[PDB]
Amino acid sequence: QVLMDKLVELAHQYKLKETIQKLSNVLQQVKIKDYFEKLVGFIDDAVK
Prior knowledge:
By secondary structure, the chain is mostly helical. It is built from 3 helices and no strands. The radius of gyration is 22 Å and the shape is rod-shaped. Apolipoprotein B is a major protein constituent of chylomicrons (apo B-48), LDL (apo B-100) and VLDL (apo B-100). Apo B-100 functions as a recognition signal for the cellular binding and internalization of LDL particles by the apoB/E receptor.
């Protein structure tokens, strides 16, 4: 029990959820609409 409690404390010290949410926030700052528009334009050019 002491060992698993120490393991739980050690795992929670890193706070992986904060890293995940920071990564998600950074990923949400990218320009996906521009890339989608470029892909749509390129596929339209190919079809034409």
